[PDB]
Design a binder for this molecule. Structure first.
Ligand SMILES: CCCCCCCC(=O)OC[C@H](COP(=O)(O)O[C@@H]1[C@H](O)[C@H](O)[C@@H](OP(=O)(O)O)[C@H](OP(=O)(O)O)[C@H]1O)OC(=O)CCCCCCC
Ligand SMILES: CCCCCCCC(=O)OC[C@H](COP(=O)(O)O[C@@H]1[C@H](O)[C@H](O)[C@@H](OP(=O)(O)O)[C@H](OP(=O)(O)O)[C@H]1O)OC(=O)CCCCCCC
Ligand SMILES: CCCCCCCCCCCC(=O)OC[C@H](COP(=O)(O)OCC[N+](C)(C)C)OC(=O)CCCCCCCCCCC
Ligand SMILES: CCCCCCCCCCCC(=O)OC[C@H](COP(=O)(O)OCC[N+](C)(C)C)OC(=O)CCCCCCCCCCC
Ligand SMILES: CCCCCCCCCCCC(=O)OC[C@H](COP(=O)(O)OCC[N+](C)(C)C)OC(=O)CCCCCCCCCCC
Ligand SMILES: CCCCCCCCCCCC(=O)OC[C@H](COP(=O)(O)OCC[N+](C)(C)C)OC(=O)CCCCCCCCCCC
Ligand SMILES: *[C@@H]1O[C@H](CO)[C@@H](O)[C@H](O)[C@H]1NC(C)=O
Ligand SMILES: *[C@@H]1O[C@H](CO)[C@@H](O)[C@H](O)[C@H]1NC(C)=O
Lengths: 457, 460
C-alpha cells in the first residue's frame, strides 16, 4: 500500500542519517575498527530482530551519542592499558548477556521511579554539549592538519591520507559544516513557518536533514580540485579494516592473549553500558522486556564486532492491524538500512564536514526541549522577561538560579570526569545525580520548589 | 556634555560604516578615481556645511545606494564613449547648480505629492536588490580571480595586485562575508531580544555593525599567511589615485579636451541626479526644499574637486532617537562630520579592514532595508497561503488575487528597471523609475478601483 511506502522512506532516511553520522564518528574515533559498515549492518540486523520479536515495534534501534561516548572512552582505556578493543567489547557483551539473564529473575523495574527529570535533562544536556564539542574539535583538527599558509607542497602523497597541509581543505570543510548546519536549521524553521502549502511544507521540513546533506554533497561534488575528507565505506559487506579484525571476533584474543583479569573485570564496563542503555530507554519511553532484548542482542552483536544499540523512540510521531503495519514498516526500514551499504559510490562522496554539520544541528535541536536549557537561558534574561511557567512563578528567582547553578556544577563535574582518564565512570557518575536529587536537594530546597522545578510532566 | 559625546560617537560610527563601505564600492567601480578618501572628505565637508547652514540638523548627508548606482552607470558610459569621468562630473555639477538656481525661481512643491508609496517602495526594493546583487557579484569575482585549484604558483607578483590565483583567498573572503552578515544579523536580533539588561542590550544592538566589523577585522588580522583584498586608503589627505587625477580638476579637461557637445548634454545626467536626490530626500523625510537645494548645490560645488555628491538621509539620526536642542543637534552633527573627516588619519587601522567584511555589511544593509517595505511583505504573502495572511487593510479589503496582481505589476516594474540597469541605458534608470509615478496615477486606476488602490497604496 502507498501508505506504508512513504512512512518507510521517511523512517529509513531519519534512521540512516544518524546512522551514517555515527558510523563516521565511530570510524574516526576507533581507528576504523568499528565504522559505517559495521554500524549499518548491526542496525539492520538488530532492527529486523526487534521488529520480529519486540513488544513495541514503535521503538527503532540505532547508535546514539552516549554509546559513542562510551565507545570512545573504552577505546582510550584499551589504548592506555594496551588491550584489544574488539575482544574487550566481546567480553563486555558476554557480561551484558549475563546481566540481562540475571535481571529477569529479580525484575528490577522499580528503578524507573529513581530516574527523574533531573537526571534526564542533565543527560540530554551533556549529550548535546558532547555533540557540539566533538564538532568543534573536528573543525580544529581539520584546521591544524591543513593550516592556512601561503606555500604548500603541491606534490604530497595521499594514498593513506594527506601527508601534509593542503590549500583549500580546511576552509572548504568549515564552509561545508556551516552550510549544512544553516540549511538544516532553515529547513526546520520552514517546517515551523507559514510559507507554502501545509502538506508540501511539512513534507519538505520532515526531510530537512537528507535535503541539506544532498545539497552539500552536490556542492562538494562540483568542487573538483579541492580535497575534503570523505566517509570511509568499503565496497560491499566488509569490516572496513581487514588488517585489524575479521567478521567473527575470536574471544581470548585476536593478536595477543586476552588476560583473565580483564575477562573478570569486564563486568563493570558492562554495568556502565547497561546504565547508559537503561537511561536512554527511560528518556525515550517517558518498557522492561524490550530493554532486555536490545541489550541481549548487543551482547551477541559484540561477538561479531558490531556495536550495541539503544531505544531511541522517534518513530511514534509519524507512525492489531496497526501493529502489523508498524512491524512491516520497521522491518522494511531495517532491510533498507542494511542494503544502504550496497550504494558505496553514493556514500563515498559524502564529506565528513557535512556529517559533522549534521552532528552540530542534532546537538542544537536536542538542546531545544530541555528545561535545564530553558533555565540556563533565563539566567541571562531579566526576571520580568521570564515566562509564565510554574517554576518561575512559584519559586524565587534566586532559588531557581541556585537550582540551575547546581545542575551546571553537575554538568561541569561530568565534563571533568569525561576529560579525566577515568572517563569510563561517566555513566555511574551521572547516575549519582539520582541520590543527589533524592537525599541532598531536599536539604537545600523545599518540597514545593523541588516539585515545581523537577516535575514528571 | 556627557550626553552629547555618546550621541556623537553613535552617529559617527553609523555614518562611518556606510562611508567606508561605499568608498570601497566606489573605488572598485571607478578604478579608484573616487575612493574612500574622497568620499570621507566630501562627507565631512558637506556635513559641517549642512550642520552650520542647514534648515533641519536632523538630516544627515552621505553616500547611498542610488548615488553609487548612478556613479557606476556614468563611469560605464564615459568609458564606452571615451569621455573623462571625473571631468564629466564637473559639468554635471555645474548643471546641478543651474538646476537648483532654476528651481528656487519656480518653487516645485507639487512634485512632492506625486511621489507616493508605490514609487518609494519600488525604489527601496530596487536598491536592496542592487546591494544583494553587488555583494554576490563581488563574491563571484573573488572566486573567479582565485579559483579552488589543486596547484598554485608558489610566488606571484602582488605589488599592483595578485597576478594569479591564491590558495585560500576566495574561501576566506566568503567566510568573512558570511561571518560579518551572520554577526550583524545576530546583533540586530539581540537588540530586539529579551536577554541581558535593557540598557546594555540596546547599546550593544545599536553598535552591531561596528562590533561585527571589528570582530571580522580581528579574525582576518589573526590569519597572517592568507591574503584577502583590503580597503585602499592613502596615508593622509591624498587623492585615491594620484596618477589619475589631482585635487582640483580642470573643467576643460585633465588629459584630453572635453567635447562641447558633452558640455551641453551634461544637463540630462544632472537632471537624473536631481531626480535621484529628490526621491531619496522624499523617502527619508516622509524646509525640505531648502535642504535638498543646499545639498545639491554642495554636491555641484564638490564635483569641482572630484568629490562625490551626497543625499539626504535620516537613518543615523532616527536610530539615535526648544532652541537648545537644535543647537545641540547642530553641534553633534558638526562633531560627527569632523570625526568622519579625521578618520582618514587612522589609515593604519582602515588598511587592515578587508573588503569581504565590508561587502558582508553591504549584504546586511540590503537585507535590513527590506523590513519596512510593503512590497516585500506582499511578495512574501505571494508564497504564504491566504489563511496565513495577516490582519492588514490591503489583505482584508482587497481580494487576494487582486493584491497578487498588484504585486505582479510591481514585480514587472522592478524587472523592467533591472533590465534598464543591465543595458547600456543604465543612466536612464532614474528617469524610468519616475515613470512609475504616471503609471500609478493614470494607468493603475484603469485596472484597479479607488478603494483597492487606496488600501494597497496608502500614505501611512
Ligand atoms: C517557485 C515555487 C512557488 C510556489 C507557490 C507558493 C505556493 C502557495 O503560495 O500556495 C498557495 C495556495 C495555498 O492556499 P490553500 O489555502 O488553497 O492551500 C491549503 C488548503 O486550503 C488546505 O485546505 C489548508 O488546510 P486547512 O483546511 O486550512 O487546515 C491549508 O492550510 P494549512 O494546512 O497550511 O494549515 C492550505 O495551505 O496553494 C497554491 O495555489 C499552490 C499552487 C502551486 C503548487 C505548489 C508549488 C509546488
Ligand atoms: C555582562 C554584565 C552585565 C551586567 C550584569 C549585572 C546583572 C544584574 O545585576 O542585573 C540583572 C539583569 C537585569 O535585570 P533587572 O531586574 O535589573 O531589570 C532591568 C532593569 O533594572 C529594569 O528594571 C527593567 O526595565 P523596567 O524599569 O522594569 O521597565 C529592564 O527591562 P527593559 O529595560 O529591557 O524593559 C531590565 O533589563 O538581569 C539579567 O538576568 C542579566 C544577566 C546578565 C549577566
Ligand atoms: C562556526 C565558527 C567557527 C570558528 C572557528 C573555526 C575553527 C578554527 C579554530 C582555529 C584552529 C587552529 O588553532 O588552527 C591552528 C592553525 C595552525 O596550526 P599548526 O601550526 O599547523 O599546528 O592555524 C590555522 O590553520 C590558521 C588560523 C586559524 C583559522 C581559523 C579561521 C576561523 C574563521 C572564523 C570565522 C567566523
Ligand atoms: C550569568 C549569571 C547571571 C545571574 C543573574 O543575573 O542572577 C540574577 C539574580 C536575581 O536575584 P533576585 O532574587 O531578583 O534579587 O541574582 C541572584 O541573586 C541569583 C544568583 C543565584 C546563583 C547564581 C549561580 C549561577 C551559576 C553558577 C555556576 C557555578
Ligand atoms: C546561498 C549561497 C551562499 C554562498 C554563495 C557562494 C558564491 C560563490 C560562487 C562562485 C562561482 C564561480 O564563479 O566559480 C568559479 C570557480 C572556477 O573558476 P573558473 O571559472 O575556472 O575561473 C575563471 O569555481 C570554483 O573555484 C568553485 C566554486 C564553488 C565554491 C563555492 C562553494 C559555495 C558553497 C555555498 C554553501 C552555502
Ligand atoms: C518577469 C515578470 C514576472 C511577473 C510575475 C507576476 C506574478 C503574479 C502572480 C499572480 C497569481 C495570482 O493571481 O494568483 C492569485 C491566486 C489566489 O486565488 P484566490 O483568489 O484565493 O482563489 O493564487 C494564489 O493562491 C497565489 C499563488 C501564487 C503563486 C505564485 C508565486 C510566484 C512568485 C514569483 C515572484 C517572486
Ligand atoms: C585500521 O585502519 C587504519 C587506517 O584506516 C590503520 O591505521 C590501522 O592500523 C588499522 N588497524 C589495525 C591494523 O589494527
Ligand atoms: C589609477 O588609475 C590608473 C589609470 O589612470 C589605473 O591603471 C590604476 O589601476 C588606478 N589605480 C588603482 C589602485 O586602481
Amino acid at each position: 500500500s502507498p501508505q506504508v511506502l512513504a512512512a518507510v522512506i521517511f523512517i529509513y532516511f531519519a534512521a540512516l542519517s544518524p546512522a551514517i553520522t555515527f558510523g563516521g564518528l565511530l570510524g574516526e574515533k576507533t581507528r576504523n575498527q568499528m565504522g559505517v559498515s559495521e554500524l549499518l549492518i548491526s542496525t539492520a540486523v538488530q532492527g529486523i530482530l526487534f521488529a520480529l520479536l519486540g513488544a513495541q515495534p514503535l521503538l527503532v534501534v540505532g547508535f546514539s551519542g552516549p554509546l559513542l561516548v562510551f565507545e570512545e572512552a573504552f577505546f582510550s582505556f584499551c589504548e592506555t592499558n594496551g588491550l584489544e578493543y574488539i575482544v574487550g567489547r566481546v567480553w563486555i557483551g558476554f557480561w551484558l548477556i549475563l546481566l540481562v539473564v540475571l535481571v529477569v529473575a529479580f525484575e528490577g523495574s522499580f528503578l524507573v521511579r529513581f530516574i527523574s527529570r533531573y537526571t534526564q535533562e542533565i543527560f540530554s544536556f551533556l549529550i548535546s554539549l558532547i555533540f557540539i564539542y566533538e564538532t568543534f574539535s573536528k573543525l580544529i583538527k581539520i584546521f591544524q592538519d591543513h593550516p592556512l599558509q601561503k606555500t604548500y607542497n603541491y606534490n604530497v602523497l595521499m594514498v593513506p591520507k594527506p601527508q601534509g597541509p593542503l590549500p583549500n581543505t580546511a576552509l572548504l570543510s568549515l564552509v561545508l559544516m556551516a552550510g549544512t548546519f544553516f540549511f538544516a536549521m532553515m529547513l526546520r524553521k520552514f517546517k515551523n513557518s507559514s510559507y507554502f502549502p501545509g502538506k508540501l511544507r511539512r513534507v519538505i521540513g520532515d526531510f530537512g536533514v537528507p535535503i541539506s546533506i544532498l545539497i552539500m554533497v552536490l556542492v562538494d561534488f562540483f568542487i573538483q580540485d579541492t580535497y575534503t575528507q570523505k566517509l570511509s565505506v568499503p565496497d560491499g559487506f566488509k569490516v572496513s579494516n581487514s588488517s585489524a579484525r575479521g567478521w567473527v571476533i575470536h574471544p581470548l584474543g585476536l593478536r595477543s592473549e586476552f588476560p583473565i583479569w580483564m575477562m573478570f573485570a569486564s563486568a563493570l564496563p558492562a554495568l556502565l553500558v547497561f546504565i547508559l542503555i537503561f537511561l536512554e530507554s527511560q528518556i525515550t519511553t517517558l518498557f522492561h522486556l524490550d530493554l532486555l532484548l536490545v541489550v541481549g542482542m548487543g551482547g551477541v552483536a559484540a561477538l561479531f564486532g558490531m556495536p550495541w544499540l539503544s531505544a531511541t523512540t522517534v518513530r511514534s510521531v509519524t507512525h492489531i492491524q496497526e501493529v502489523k503495519e508498524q512491524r512491516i514498516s520497521g522491518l522494511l526500514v531495517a532491510v533498507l538500512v542494511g542494503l544502504s551499504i550496497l550504494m558505496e559510490p553514493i556514500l563515498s562522496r559524502i564529506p565528513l564536514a557535512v556529517l559533522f554539520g549534521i552532528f552540530l544541528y542534532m546537538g542544537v535541536t536536542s538542546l531545544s526541549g530541555i528545561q535545564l536549557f530553558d533555565r540556563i537561558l533565563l539566567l541571562f534574561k531579566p526576571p520580568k522577561y521570564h515566562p509564565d511557567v510554574p517554576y518561575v512563578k512559584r519559586v524565587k528567582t534566586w532559588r531557581m538560579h541556585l537550582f540551575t547553578g547546581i545542575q551546571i556544577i553537575c554538568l561541569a563535574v561530568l565534563w571533568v570526569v569525561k576529560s579525566t582518564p577515568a572517563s569510563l565512570a561517566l555513566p555511574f557518575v551521572l547516575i549519582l545525580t539520582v541520590p543527589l536529587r533524592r537525599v541532598l536537594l531536599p536539604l537545600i530546597f523545599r518540597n514545593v520548589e523541588l516539585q515545581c522545578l523537577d516535575a514528571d510532566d
